[PDB]
Design a protein around this nucleic acid. Sequence first.
DNA 1: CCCTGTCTGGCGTCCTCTCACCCCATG
DNA 2: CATGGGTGCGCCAGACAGGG
Lengths: 492, 55, 82, 51, 446, 95, 252
Amino acid sequence: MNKEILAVVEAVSNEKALPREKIFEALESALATATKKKYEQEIDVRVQIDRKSGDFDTFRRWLVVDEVTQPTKEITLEAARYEDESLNLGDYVEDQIESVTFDRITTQTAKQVIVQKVREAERAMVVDQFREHEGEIITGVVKKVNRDNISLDLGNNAEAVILREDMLPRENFRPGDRVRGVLYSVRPEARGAQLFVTRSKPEMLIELFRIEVPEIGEEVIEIKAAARDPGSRAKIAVKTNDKRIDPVGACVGMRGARVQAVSTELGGERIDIVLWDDNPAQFVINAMAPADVASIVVDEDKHTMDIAVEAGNLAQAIGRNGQNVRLASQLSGWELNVMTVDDLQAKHQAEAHAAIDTFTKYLDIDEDFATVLVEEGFSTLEELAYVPMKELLEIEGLDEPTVEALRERAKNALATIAQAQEESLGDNKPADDLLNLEGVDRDLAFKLAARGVCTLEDLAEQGIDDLADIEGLTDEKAGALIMAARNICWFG
Amino acid sequence: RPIGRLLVDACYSPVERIAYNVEAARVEQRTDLDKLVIEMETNGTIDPEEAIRRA
Amino acid sequence: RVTVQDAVEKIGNRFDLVLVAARRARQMQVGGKDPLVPEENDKTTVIALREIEEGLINNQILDVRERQEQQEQEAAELQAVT
Amino acid sequence: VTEFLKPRLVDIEQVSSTHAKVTLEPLERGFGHTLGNALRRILLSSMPGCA
Amino acid sequence: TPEEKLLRAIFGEKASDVKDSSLRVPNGVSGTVIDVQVFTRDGVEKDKRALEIEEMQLKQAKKDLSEELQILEAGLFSRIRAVLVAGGVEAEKLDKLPRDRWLELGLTDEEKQNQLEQLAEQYDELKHEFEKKLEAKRRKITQGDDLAPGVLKIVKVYLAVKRRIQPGDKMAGRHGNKGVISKINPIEDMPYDENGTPVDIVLNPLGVPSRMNIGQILETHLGMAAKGIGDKINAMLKQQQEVAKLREFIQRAYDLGADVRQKVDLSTFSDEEVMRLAENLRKGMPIATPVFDGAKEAEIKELLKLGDLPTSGQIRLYDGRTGEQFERPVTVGYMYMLKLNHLVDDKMHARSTGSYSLVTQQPLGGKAQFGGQRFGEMEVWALEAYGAAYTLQEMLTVKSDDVNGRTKMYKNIVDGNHQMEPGMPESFNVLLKEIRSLGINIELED
Amino acid sequence: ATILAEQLEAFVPEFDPILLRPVDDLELTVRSANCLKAEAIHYIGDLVQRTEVELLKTPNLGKKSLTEIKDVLASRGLSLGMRLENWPPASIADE
Amino acid sequence: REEAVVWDILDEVIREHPVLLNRAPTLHRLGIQAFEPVLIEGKAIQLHPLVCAAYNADFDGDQMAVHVPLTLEAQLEARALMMSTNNILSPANGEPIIVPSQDVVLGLYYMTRDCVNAKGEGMVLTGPKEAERLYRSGLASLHARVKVRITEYEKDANGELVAKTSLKDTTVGRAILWMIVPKGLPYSIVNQALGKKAISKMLNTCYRILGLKPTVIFADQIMYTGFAYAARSGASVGIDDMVIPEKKHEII
DNA sequence: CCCTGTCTGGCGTCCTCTCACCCCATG
DNA sequence: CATGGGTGCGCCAGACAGGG
Ligand SMILES: [Mg+2]
């Protein structure tokens, strides 16, 4: 009876490595809840278990509050202090109440609350101790297969889930099968599956390589990037600081044994291992393997790279359904345009001709001088307007007066182009002039400007009949806007 | 809900016996017209014109 | 459904009707096969006799389809192995 | 107390031509007969026409 | 569990593995608890409600015997007042003194003082008798009762159901015209007549020429005659008519016949009994018809002529649905019909899966025991007579006897797979054990 | 239906009146009602102006009677410490 | 608890699931027949009247047992062997066992009969539809002899129904009952007075010619029109209906 | 042994619904 | 306490005597 409480507390404390205090607090809450259910009225109840005897006293708790909303469970601070002057806001006032007999009903409630406390203590500490597993490749047994997810048993009442998107496209699991996967997220669904496991994401590939390649687990080789088409093909980029170690050779292993072990675990996924380079162009050449790259052109402003290949290698460089270029682009972070050497030259000739036409049209220069600007690397009016004067003065035949005139023309061309578009639609010119009339939204200003009504004066000159076809403009609203425009233009 | 209430059955019905007797009409010079004479039998809780109006 | 007269007109024994319709309803209920006639949320028994009345099911066609869809499963297994 | 089950013609299964079958639900535990009898007696004679 | 054995910690007793469970009762009947009896074998502690019933019955018997003494003492004092009307009467002096001394007043040795002495003997007998009988009645209430071997207390509770009527009860007249009441129509659908009143019950005419009980039609016509006289009394009384016209009509309705036995006259009822006799006749006039010396046809006709009913007994009746007349006028009247206690919510029963018998694993029999209907031998013959073979196999292996077969069946039904795993009847194994328990060696070959 | 329907167209600021009630109408325990009467609290409008801290100073008013008063006031949508401007109305000042 | 959602569940499982009704003294095989349930507010099994002549079941306090075919082969045996539409001939002979018993033959015998004068004596009618229209409106009587024009379908070819239309000197009730007869039977099956032997051989000739399904639907239409016109008949029994012979006392 | 009288056995409708009561006796 | 100590049914039918 008495000594049995101590023996139970000691057995549970030792078996679940849990603080005795946390078990008692929970038993007190369990007994309070079991007591509340025996009364027809909603009462507040505190239970206190004596830590030496295992005896327990049950109260009618009265949550000491400032304002009473529930007179059956709450008492004012003034009324609580009339019974005991030591009470504060948030304390409990008690009332001698018959403790519930410990029948198999309370026993079952106590068992359930202990089990729940162990899930939030023993199992929580087990998950904390398995900080590596929360991130590394956990191993589970398939408990249940549904259409949209697989429930894994990890042991110790821990359940994990693999979602349909987190599976490989050709995997078929049965109840009782062993499955490995990366624990990529821990949420708070204690009841059910709080653990989310992936086999499809790139982290599964990284951690399989960490286990299979000791040199990655020892931090001698680093995986810098991983790009993956799950169950089909992946690319990994590897670097080492030790010049004595070939990082690609280490990840492949003797006759490919290491990469084949990882591929086999991923259902026969093809894995390319590439050397990481700190030069983006050299890294993209490596990422494009097994296709040979002839030339690369880098557009830093668009964050894009044009990759020229021999006409025989084009199909290999793109890969089946663009898989090779897509995985290389995801691995590099660059947008990759794969074309032939002939197509790249034709593209550059078309861009050079478009730049020459743009410069000839807007800068009032001859085609010979526009060609020199494009040969010196200028492709946009913005570059010519904003580039440091020193770079323009390095061009053979440019003097300081001609560079100043060229920049002034480039700035004037940009201003004209911007103003034209803003007046054609409702970007700035019609979004201020035509939109001056109170009531003009940006959409209506662009609809007006599409009819050639670009200014508040143009609107003041219109009739209601001239605007009647504008979708969303009633004759009354047209008349109000024309009158508002006339009041500002003619009577302001 | 308490033990002291007593529930009787509820016959919410004011009328007892409704008998119509159709008969020939002569007030109007036009013949082949009919008169509908309805003798109801109320228990006093319903006015007869109110009964025929609700019906 | 009221009478089963034409389901005996097409299977003359009136006892083989029960075997063929039971085999058909066991294929439709637990095995998860689609009915060959569009239903009206009838139970699987009436859908079985309704397929019998169309003529598209009797014991000959059921043996033909079980042999072909057993040979298909073993052919899929053999082409998966070799 | 004056709130009854207001009915409606859920379907008009007009069988073939010059023939319909109009079903009306739901009525009270006794109003099917009074509407059937009223419509039956009126259609029979009251309804006018030429012949 | 540790928490189940921790009953001793917070409380005591022992362990909680023991199945805690309160004897709760089954369904099928409503009611209102009208009377509770509690009997206690002597020695057992009476609880608070048994002491409440003991105080209640002590109080009832105390009040009842005290009212016996008070009522018989009131009759005795009324006798004393009736005796002292003459012979030394005191008109004012009688109620000045308390009432228990009505004997020592001025009166000589006569029959009256002798009678007051005899009433004093009776009164003192009632006093000492009331003392000893109240002591004996407290003994009868307070004592225990001899009961069954090993029972503490018996609680008896009286539910009082009120069963109305429904489609399925059995009603019948007094001539053999039985019948299950089949539809409880609304008021409007009933065939009414050209006065307005709906008929209550519509029987079937075709039961008369085959089942030759022609007496029910004469009973119907004479009942309509009786109610015609009752309606004429109700009409002559609802109009607040003086007693002369009521006397006239009641006398004409009581003469009305051949040489008969009754021969009453209302000239010796004195104008107040005739109103109360008409208060009792207004719901109909009762008519005696002795067994083999009864009312002939012409007397029924002459009594139907006294009321203004049609002579042939048949009123033309309209319809409730169509509102148009039934051709060939029909017979209405009053028949005296009885409800029989073969009700329908005492016969109706249904069983999915209940308890099973012990010696042969088949369901129990009856309704109080929640049982299943006997699929008897002739029904087995009637299913052999069709070609139904699987229906009979599950009708005597799966649904009835084989225990593993029926648990497989219950799992298969709640999972949607209609399929039976047959097995063997367990009662056939009982047949093997009973034949094998003789010197006979029955087996199962192969 | 048109014929049959045409053949039938000739037939077819001190709260409110609750503040003016006496405290006895609140169904309070005989203890709570007698404690309020001892402090000259006669109307519900007088009770609603008093704070919980003021009611606890009243002789013989316990924490239990204060909870009863709150639960009863809450059942009527009233709370302790509401300020009524112009209470008591001149209609009550003459009793 | 019997919540509000289990009654829709119940109307889902009852549908297309036959039950075996069984009278307690089952003597022959027609005393176990399989029906489809229709749910009843009540506590009494409602049993179709024609089927009663098979069970020897009156309604004077009788009781019946219901049994549920659990498995799937048993549902199919209840529908395909033991269904009540399948038992329309007694196995002891060739006589139909779904013969109309007592109210319905009175309704027919009052309907198809004649009297020498009624409303609409000897008027001429363009079809059975206006025969029923003249009976309902109140212009003729149910038994009033009349020339109608009926179109009887005689199937004299090899499975082809040939229409022959003619004027039969008949009554109003015989035309109204001709609206219910299926196509292949001749008009002379209703031209007589239709007692009980005549309606039994009517259903028997319908079963021998047109097969099972018109005979089931025609047995139901017989029962419905017999009950309806027996209700319209008002065929009571009185004390005056038993006519004493005037010659009885002189014979005695 | 061939017929005659006797002596014992085997059997007689199906479903249901209540009720009442189940071994003394005693050294 | 624990054990142990009526006399109103009627037919069929075959086996067992019983004459014959
Ligand atoms: Mg019977």
